[model samples]
Target: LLVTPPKALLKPLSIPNQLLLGPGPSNLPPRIMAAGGLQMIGSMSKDMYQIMDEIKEGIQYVFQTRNPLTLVISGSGHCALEAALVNVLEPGDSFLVGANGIWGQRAVDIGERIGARVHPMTKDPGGHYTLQEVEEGLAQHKPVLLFLTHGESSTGVLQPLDGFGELCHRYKCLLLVDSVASLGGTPLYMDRQGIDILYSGSQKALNAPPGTSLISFSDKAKKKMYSRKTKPFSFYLDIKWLANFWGCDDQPRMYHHTIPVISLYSLRESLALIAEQGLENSWRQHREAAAYLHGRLQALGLQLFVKDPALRLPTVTTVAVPAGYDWRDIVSYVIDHFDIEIMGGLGPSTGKVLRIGLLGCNATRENVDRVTEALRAALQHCPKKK
Candidate 1:
C-alpha cells in the first residue's frame, strides 16, 4: 500500500551550527533570547507606537545624538546605506568615495545606479584617506556628497574621520558614512563627527540578530529628503512615508506595510543593552580586545592583512592566507573539526586572506583567545605546500 505524504513537508534551514566568527550576525546576547519571545503587537497600536518611541529614545542614547530623525529601517545595514542615498541625493549629483574595500565599491555602485557621478579617491587597501586627501578629492570633484566606510570589514580596516567632516562642510558636501561593522567597536559621535548621514547594523558590535539597520540623519539630510525633485528611485525602501508617520507629536499611526515586529523587538532589546553598557565603554572594550587580538594573532605567525595597526578595524581581524594555503579550506576545517566559523576575504582579497570577526558578544578576551587557539591549531595541521 502506498502512503500519502503529510500535509506539510519539513525542510531544514540551510545554515550551519558553528560558532560565527565571520563578519556579521555575531552571537546574540542571552537577553535577546528572552526579548525574541515578546508578545506581538499591531504596528499601529498605541502600544507599538510607544515601543517605537522607546526605540527612538534608546537609539538616541546609544548614538548619543539628539536628532529626532535618528531611527532604523527593517532590513540589513545596506538598506540604510541605500535609503540615505536615494532620499537625499538626486540624479546628476556628484559625489566622492574612497574605494578601499568592498563597502567603498558598494558605495560607488549605489551612487552610479542613481545616476550620480562618482569619483574614486585612491586609497591603499591597508591604508586610509587623510582628512587632507578627502579635502583634495572634494576640491577636485566639487561633489554634493562624500562617502566613506568607517569600518572596512572586508580588510579589517577602520578609516579615520577626524577633520574629515570639517572638510566635507568646507566643500559644501554632506558626509555619508557606512558604519555597519564598526559602530560598537569604534568611537562614533554622529553629531560631533559632523556625519550628515550615518548607518549601522545590529548584528555586529550591537549584538542583535541581523534584520535591522539604524541611522542618524542631520537636518541637512532631512531637508534633502523633503526637497526631492523626483519621486525617490525606490518605493519599498523609501523613508519619506516613514518620516511622515514617525515625525509627529502624538500622531495617529498607520500601517507601513507588515512591520518586522519581532526584529524590531530584538533591536529594542539590543539598543537597551548598548545604553546599559554605555556606548563609549562598549566601544572601548572592543578596541582593547582588538589590540589583544592583534598581539595574539601575531604570535601565532598570522600577519594582518591591514598593514597599519591604527587603520585596523577593531571588530574584525583580516590576515593574508599564508602562501600556498587555501583560505576557504582552512575556514571549512575550522568549522568541521573545531566547530568554529571564520570567513574568507571578498572581492580582490578572496582566497588570499582570512577574516576573523570579534564583535558584539564575541568581542571578549575569552572568545578572542578561543578563536586564536583554533586558528593556531588549524595552521599547524595544514600542509606547508606553497
Candidate 2:
C-alpha cells in the first residue's frame, strides 16, 4: 500500500533571505552558508579528526587562549553556560550572578536548579554595575564562583571586565564569563583578561549556524572541575567526558556522542573568515557600524536604552520605544514590509525597547543603512504620545 505524504512536508521550503538585525542568528554570508552544505563525513574519520583539530586551533585563535580545555559543545549557548556551571558548582556551593538582564536571570535560575546557593547582584535595566558594586557583592556573598554576562543583549549594556578577573582571584573565586553576544564583535582576551572560563555562541559574530557552542577553560577552572565532590549532574554536559571526546585530555579520543559534522565545517569556515579579516578589524567594524546606527537613531530622535555610549555593547543596540508607541507594531511593520528583523526587548526591558544587532557579516555600513531606513519608515505608523 502506498501512503500519501503530508501536504506541509510536500511544499517547497520558502525561506526569504531576510536581514537578521535582531539579537542573534545573524544572516550568514554566502561563504559560511555554503560550508554547511558540504558532504557529511564519518564522526571517527581521519578527515573529521583533522577538521576537529582545525576547529580547536581556530577557536583558540578567536578566543586568544592557549587553554588545552578549549572546545565546542554540540548545543546552543545555554548548553555551554550550563556545562560551565554544573562542572564547577556542586550542590550547596555559593554562587554569585551579575543579574542585569535576561541572561543573568537565566543563569540564576540554572544555578538554583543545580542546587547552588545563588546570590544575585542585580542592576537596573539599561544600567551596569561598577567594579565597586561587584566587589561589595563578593565581600558580602563570598561565593566560590562569579558569573558575569560580558554582553547583556536584552539591554545592550556591556559589563566592564577590566581588573574584574584579578578581583575575583583576590577574593579566592573563579571568574566565568558569558560572551555569547560579544565575542567576535568586541575585544576579549581570555588569558590576558584573567578569565577562568568563557563561552560564546556560533550564530552571533561568528556568523555560523546556531547548533555549536564555543567554550574554553583556564587551568584553574579545570582544577575546580577535577575536585568536584560529586559528578556533573548531566552526563552529556560532563566536562571530563566532553573534554576527552574533544581531544582535550591526554587520553585517546573516545566516543561520547556523534559530533555535528556539518556544523563544525561551517564553524571552521566562519573562523577562517574571521582570521582572514582579523578579529581586531571585526571589532572595529562592529564599532563603526554601531556608531553609524546610533547616529541614525539620534537623527530619528529616538533615545538609546543605555545612557552611556561607552557602556553600550557594539553588537546589540537597545532603542527605546517612542512614548505611547506599541513596540510590537513597529517590529511587525519592519518584518512585514522589509522582511528584516528588529527585535523587541526581553525580561526587564520588554515592551520598552527594541534590540537591534550588528553581528559578524551583518555588521556592515550598508546593512546599517538598510535597517535605519526601515526603522524610519516603520516609525511613521507608530504614533508617539503627545
lDDT of each structure?
0.82, 0.92
Worst 10 residues of 1 by lDDT: 244-253
Structural similarity to truth (TM-score) of each candidate: 0.94, 0.97
* Candidate 2 off by > 4 Å: 1-4, 383-386
Q: Compute the lDDT of residue 194 as modeled in candidate 2.
A: 91
The top-ranked prediction according to lDDT is 2
Against the true structure, candidate 2 has what lDDT?
Answer: 0.92
Model 2, 1-386: lDDT tens per residue? 48787889989889886888999989898998899888999998889989989999998999899999999999999999999999999999999999999998999999999999999998778878778988998999998899999999999998888899999999989999999999998899989999999999999998999989999999999999999889989999999998998889889988898999999999999999999999899999999999999998889889998898899999999998988788998998999999999899999999889999999989988988888889899888766668
Residue lDDT tens for model 1, 1-386: 48786645556547565678888879887898788988888877777767778888887776667887877787898888888888877898887988888888888889899988889876656667887788888988899899988998888888888778888988889999898998878888888888888888989988888888888788887777777788889876677666655553245545566667788888889888888888888888988998998899899888888887888898988998887777766787788888888899886567668998988778889878888888888888876675
Tell how far residue 2 is off in model 2, in angstroms: 14
